[PDB]
Amino acid sequence: MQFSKMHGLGNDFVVVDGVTQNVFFTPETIRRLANRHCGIGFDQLLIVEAPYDPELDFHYRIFNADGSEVSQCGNGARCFARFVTLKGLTNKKDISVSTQKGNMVLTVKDDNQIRVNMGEPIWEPAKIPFTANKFEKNYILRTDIQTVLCGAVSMGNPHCVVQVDDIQTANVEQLGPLLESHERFPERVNAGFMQIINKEHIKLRVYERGAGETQACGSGACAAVAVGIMQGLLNNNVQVDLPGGSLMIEWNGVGHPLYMTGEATHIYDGFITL
Numbered sequence: 001m002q003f004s005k006m007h008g009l010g011n012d013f014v015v016v017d018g019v020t021q022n023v024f025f026t027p028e029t030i031r032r033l034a035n036r037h038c039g040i041g042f043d044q045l046l047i048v049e050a051p052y053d054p055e056l057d058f059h060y061r062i063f064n065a066d067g068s069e070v071s072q073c074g075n076g077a078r079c080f081a082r083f084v085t086l087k088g089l090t091n092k093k094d095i096s097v098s099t100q101k102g103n104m105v106l107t108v109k110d111d112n113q114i115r116v117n118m119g120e121p122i123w124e125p126a127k128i129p130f131t132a133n134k135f136e137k138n139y140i141l142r143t144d145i146q147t148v149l150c151g152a153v154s155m156g157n158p159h160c161v162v163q164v165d166d167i168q169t170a171n172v173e174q175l176g177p178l179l180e181s182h183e184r185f186p187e188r189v190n191a192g193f194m195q196i197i198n199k200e201h202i203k204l205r206v207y208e209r210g211a212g213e214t215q216a217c218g219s220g221a222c223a224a225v226a227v228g229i230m231q232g233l234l235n236n237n238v239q240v241d242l243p244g245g246s247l248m249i250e251w252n253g254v255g256h257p258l259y260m261t262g263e264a265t266h267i268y269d270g271f272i273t274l
């Protein structure tokens with residue numbers, strides 16, 4: 001198996017061309033390869049596949065370090081765009097991709113950043129998925145040590161966004177794991193902790209489903225901003241500062257796609273026998 005190693009703000013990926021290779025594996029193999037000392041080392045593994053809808057350019061699959069397959073990853077989408085460009089799978093400036101859920105568009109900007117059309121955020125609890133009687137802007141999640149309030153939203157993956165007073169002292173280390181597998185999120189959830197600096201600027205930490213606290217989560221940045229906009233606490237264009245760097249999120253509201261712009265970097269190429 002040929003692969004490439006990439007990162008987006010220090011959220012690191014194995015990216016595989018599954019167009020010119022026949023790529024498949026077990027979750028055990030994913031977990032072995034994710035290990036940083038005895039494997040390759042990654043937060044997620046991404047596959048570029050031929051599209052099912054031949055009008056699109058590619059299909060996009062995402063696997064967490066724990067071996068789980070999921071339907072979204074924003075930092076990965078930016079790396080996907082850089083990968084297919086660098087490796088000559090396409091030279092289009094606007095690249096259309098499917099996932100297990102919805103479609104996206106990856107735009108390779110002249111400054112080399114990638115702007116991703118992530119699709120429209122999803123609010124309906126059953127679709128997140130999230131167990132709730134009714135849609136609300138804030139939901140109560142009881143944990144063993146604290147009851148917290150969150151907004152809940154899907155970007156193709158589930159997010160619970162908790163607002164915090166101070167990002168450095170937020171109890172991500174204990175609350176993250178308790179929220180990630182909270183009973184009300186039947187497919188688990190990415191737990192984001194958001195400090196609002198002003199209506200155009202937040203700081204964010206994300207305890208990811210399947211990966212723990214990474215250096216950056218693009219979909220989590222998207223979700224945090226969507227939630228703050230829904231709650232009337234943020235404006236439509238927001239700088240999000242994650243441990244590994246910043247992203248720009250733009251969302252004009254319900255009915256509109258959400259856009260995420262930031263860096264993506266190729267590191268090295270590899271070969272491994274699975």
Ligand SMILES: *C[C@](N)(CCC[C@H](N)C(=O)O)C(=O)O
Nearest residue numbers: 073074075157209217218219
């Ligand atoms: C790649 C990622 N950090 C999201 C990866 C998937 C989540 N861990 C999930 O399980 O939904 C991003 O940048 O969005």
